[PDB]
Amino acid sequence: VLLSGTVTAKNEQYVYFDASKGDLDEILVSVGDKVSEGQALVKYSSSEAQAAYDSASRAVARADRHINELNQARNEAASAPANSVASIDAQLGDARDARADAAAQLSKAQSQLDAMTVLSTLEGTVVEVNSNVSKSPTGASQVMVHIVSNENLQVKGELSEYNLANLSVGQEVSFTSKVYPDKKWTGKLSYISDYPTGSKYPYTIDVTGEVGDLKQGFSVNMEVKSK
Amino acid sequence: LLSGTVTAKNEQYVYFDASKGDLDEILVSVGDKVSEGQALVKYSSSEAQAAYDSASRAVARADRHINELNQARNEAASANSVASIDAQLGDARDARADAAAQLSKAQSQLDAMTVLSTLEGTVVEVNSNVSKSPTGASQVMVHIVSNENLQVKGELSEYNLANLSVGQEVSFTSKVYPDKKWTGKLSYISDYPKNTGSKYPYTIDVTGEVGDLKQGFSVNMEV
Amino acid sequence: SVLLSGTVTAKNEQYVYFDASKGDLDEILVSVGDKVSEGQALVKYSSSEAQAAYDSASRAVARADRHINELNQARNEAASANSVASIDAQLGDARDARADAAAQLSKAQSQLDAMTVLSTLEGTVVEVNSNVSKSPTGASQVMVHIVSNENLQVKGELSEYNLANLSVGQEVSFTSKVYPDKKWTGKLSYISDYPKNNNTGSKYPYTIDVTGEVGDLKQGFSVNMEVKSKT
Amino acid sequence: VLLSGTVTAKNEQYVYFDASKGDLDEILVSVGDKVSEGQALVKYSSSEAQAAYDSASRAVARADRHINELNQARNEAASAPANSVASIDAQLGDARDARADAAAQLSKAQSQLDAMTVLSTLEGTVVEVNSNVSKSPTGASQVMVHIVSNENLQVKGELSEYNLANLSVGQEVSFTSKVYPDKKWTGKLSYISDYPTGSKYPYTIDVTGEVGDLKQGFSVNMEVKSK
Amino acid sequence: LLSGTVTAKNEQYVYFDASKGDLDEILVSVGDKVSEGQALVKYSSSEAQAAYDSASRAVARADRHINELNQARNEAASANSVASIDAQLGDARDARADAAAQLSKAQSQLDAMTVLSTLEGTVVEVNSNVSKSPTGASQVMVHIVSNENLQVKGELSEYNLANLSVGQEVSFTSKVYPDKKWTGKLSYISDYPKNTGSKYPYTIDVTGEVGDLKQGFSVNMEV
Amino acid sequence: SVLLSGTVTAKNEQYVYFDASKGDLDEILVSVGDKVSEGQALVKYSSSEAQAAYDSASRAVARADRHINELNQARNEAASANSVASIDAQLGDARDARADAAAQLSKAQSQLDAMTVLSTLEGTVVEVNSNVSKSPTGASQVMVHIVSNENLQVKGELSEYNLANLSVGQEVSFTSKVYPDKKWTGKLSYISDYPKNNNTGSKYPYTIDVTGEVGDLKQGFSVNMEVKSKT
């Protein structure tokens, strides 16, 4: 049995415009760069986030002071020659709670700041930048950065109803490429689906050995046995 | 003579939900077998955990206030008045009730950060690249199908609908394996067409010995 | 006489679409191919928050009543020499509080029964779908579709010519190319004055109600009809 | 010159589902009814509106009381044997203002109640009801009731680039109908456009005399002169 | 040899805006002539008028407070202290400034309930039936065109673009009136195609004697 | 050598779409067919509310400074016997207020200059449109489109075959069927590893930068090219 797939990349990352994050400052990457696993890619305007952060830490510090004046007032009104120590122990409770509130909010604003710059999840090739996107429910999704890893290649395809009854997972195969009639690369079948002129099910093969000169999107061809 | 396709019966589509914050991690690839009540996708449990902790501090605050109140009754009952201290003990009891309620709501909102499977089956599609902004279309992140309790669904025409059946135990073949028969019991004939004629979908619960039969096979069986 | 084409359609139907403003879905409690009668529930959203709202509201009426009572016991104690004018004012401000508590309560009541959508007709459920998104992701998400297989009708359109030949009330016979020995009757019940929207002419929708015994006549059937003239 | 239009109605009213108004109770009209100029058509759920209204009038009444206790307290503290009369004259100002606030809001909630039932703007024929609409940005506009008046008919059409240079507004014409070859109706041209195989401009004719048996949508035909 | 169409130069599309409340009345039919700064559509001026009145009461309240303040200075300056009364007179001045600001904002939001024309011209399209809910599409309620300062717009191909012109005074005809010529001065040739070839739009400001020439006419003029 | 087709495209461009979150539009202050340089304004929204925000913010810093000062004069008066601890606390709470006032002020500053959108490049404006709606009525409303007619390029796609014959850097000649006596040169600058998305094959986008004198060569021109092999 002769099959034909196309070689795809395994790992991608898309980056869409997030309206809820405000306004884009600059995309700091160019279509062609190989980016680190943790390299930055997009920076939103981070002034409102930094301001909310500062306000949060001032709220925390003010909570700590406030409990400190309450503390002195307590240990004065107590060892007092005898307003109430309990009347402000209440306030102490309702001030430690406000302190914990401001603490949690500070951490929230902290990551609300970290969210303003988008990092990669992978080292690959940026293949698309688009700095001209709008903040409006535009009816579609506005891609801003597309990164795909050119390593751990696979080859994906489909097979007919008849064609599934021709062996399965864990099989090693070898394929050929119409642009390099000489060489043949090998692969170990990684996945066959049982979920879809004939119904078609998708297969994926993790590729063995050296990639050599195979580019993504290359049309390939194989030969395996059936039943 | 009619044709139909064998389909699974139970699925689960998880769609990215923006209201639950943002995605942290999808916990299954493709081809995995999942079971009833199993972790599938986990949103960031952060501003949810903070709300839980705040609600907890709220119930503990209500408890502190009621202690500060009934001790202040124990003082002013053997010494403003017990009337307007017992009363505010009532309103304090109310406040503690509210605190426990919104605490439970915080718990539900919390463990909702992680969606669980509703079936035992195989994962078919995972799509971790999804836009938090509205796309204008559904965005599936995970799909589960069970390859058990199969069925055959199809359509009948205005004429062959004049064959009826509440459950004729029929049986079918398909040119993938032509020397085999599979039996099934009819289960549904629609009286309402969809949308040259009006077509009416039919279903049949396949019955036993479903060996190499899987869910893409075109299928024919006449009568 | 006058001949018309038309299709067998139902008269009464109901779609229930997903509603995010009602919260989250628990169960849909109906399976496709189920008879339902007017009033039966067909979807239940999770009634948790609505429950808590009902409880907190009842406690609002409770605390409000307690307040009116304590202010009452505290007005008489002042009528035997704050002052009874201060208490009168606070009373006027606690009756308002109790009215707000009542309104809040009934809001919780109607939001509570709004977590179970009910059927508007005797009918048969033709589609159920428990796979929806929350984010007004796309268009309308039909969750349950039901339609009465009784009181069947047939509809179509009419030429500008047919409008001058036809009046509402005229009797009608019709047949179906699948049951050629079987025949039906019916009556012209609605003729539209208003047009929808190589040969020309605008088309006006008509609907007739089938009369007499309906046999194994099922919706969607193509139908050929003769409208009887009048003496 | 021979023209061909179609007879249209002049006056319509559409009624779309309004999500911001809450939930539909019932459409109280049936496709075929002739409705009054002020007849009702759709009723939304009006319990939240009535509740907000009641709350508004209680807010007004509480404002009036409040200024009355402030009033007694003033005229006591004044002719007082000599807290401050000015200190609560301030409160009186800041209570008459709250009173005016609650008044305006009460009127607002009043029309927020009147908005819960939709009335006609015309007596005509309801031609469409649709009680099965959803509260979601459905991508389209969900018509709920469509009313068109079958009187003050017009006939509308278009004409080619050549065809405009054939006289204009204020002209009387007469037309014929392929379903009644006998009769001919007359009309007085009401509008020609200068704003668009040829560009087409639209004309409308108000119809003279008796409508007789002309239905809307009837294809008509005429004869007028050019230049 | 090229063809073009005569178009108007200045228009105005009014779209229904939900944020401005709801429509009260459109004040023009079709065929009417409107002029610069003329009432066109009027939204309901109700919750806007209420906000204006409230802002006015706010400025009068700030004035009352400053009088209550400096009179309280006139008492305690020849009798807490002038310090913390002069200071709060400063903050009161601030408050009056804010009140006047939000008052002016209330005025702008008020007269925005009524949109005015930006041209002198004829009204082309009025559409009073519009859904307050989002349609998923623009909803024009009124359209104004001026039938003065006409133009001719069209497109050139990749080849005939090799005729250039910053402003060749050309002239054209059209088979509506074949025995007449209309002169025009070129005004724009795009260097950027739109979207068999790449087409480049051109414009020409028509010049004088535009008698029976109106805005739908296909037009031809070669060179 | 290797021959390729391609179209004359520009390198740098800018769309400015309507933004409701910026308020209302006043003027667009550019007409189609205008040269613009990097930094020039191209739309001005009505800066009224932003102005009022700036003013109220400056008054916030004013009143805050007044407060810190009055508390300062009032701490010394207490340091010569409320108490100076109370004043110390209020001071710590007025420095916070002044910091909030500063942050609010700069928020008003950046929102103020955000009411004038500026150009990102030397370019020519190719479309202006002052007829928009506010209600995210539909899709994206392009209000002004500008694009540099300098630094022109040509782009297209490549077969799977072409990928093995071509490297970035190779010199290129090309011509246009409208100026048949005139010829151009250029260099291969970008070859995509990643494919877009009766005969078959996936296609990979390429872009080359034109070099030397650009004549009356205008964007969109169809172009035929020869890529020089290497010794």
Author numbering:
A (entry chain A), D (entry chain A): 60 to 141, 164 to 277, 292 to 322
B (entry chain C), E (entry chain C): 61 to 139, 164 to 279, 292 to 319
C (entry chain B), F (entry chain B): 59 to 139, 164 to 279, 290 to 323
Sentences from the paper on this structure:
As initial efforts to get the full-length structure of Spr0693 failed after exhaustive trials, we made a series of truncations and finally a truncated version (Ser59–Lys324) without the membrane-proximal (MP) domain, enabled us to solve the structure at 3.0 Å. The quaternary structure of Spr0693 displays a typical hexameric nanotube, similar to the previously reported MFP structures. The two outermost α-helices form a twisted left-handed α-helical hairpin domain; and six helical hairpins further pack into a cylindrical assembly to form an α-helical barrel of 31 Å in diameter and 56 Å in height. The 24-Å high lipoyl domain at the middle harbors two layers of three-stranded β-sheets packing against each other, with a topology similar to the biotinyl/lipoyl carrier proteins and domain family. The β-barrel domain at the bottom is composed of six twisted anti-parallel β-strands and a short α-helix, which form a stacked β-barrel of 24 Å in height. The six lipoyl domains, as well as the six β-barrel domains, are aligned in a head-to-tail manner to form a double-layered ring-like structure in the quaternary structure. A top view of the Spr0693 cylinder structure reveals a narrow pore, which is formed by the loops (residues Asn211–Val224) from the lipoyl domains. These loops adopt a so-called turn-back conformation and point towards the center, forming a hexameric ring with the residue Gly220 at the innermost site. However, the glycine residue Gly220, as well as the loop, has a relatively higher B-factor, and the primary sequence of the loop is variable in the homologs of Spr0693, suggesting that the ring is structurally flexible and might have a rather broad spectrum of substrate selectivity. Structural superposition reveals that the hexameric Spr0693 shares an overall architecture quite similar to that of MacA, with an RMSD of 2.85 Å over 1226 Cα atoms.
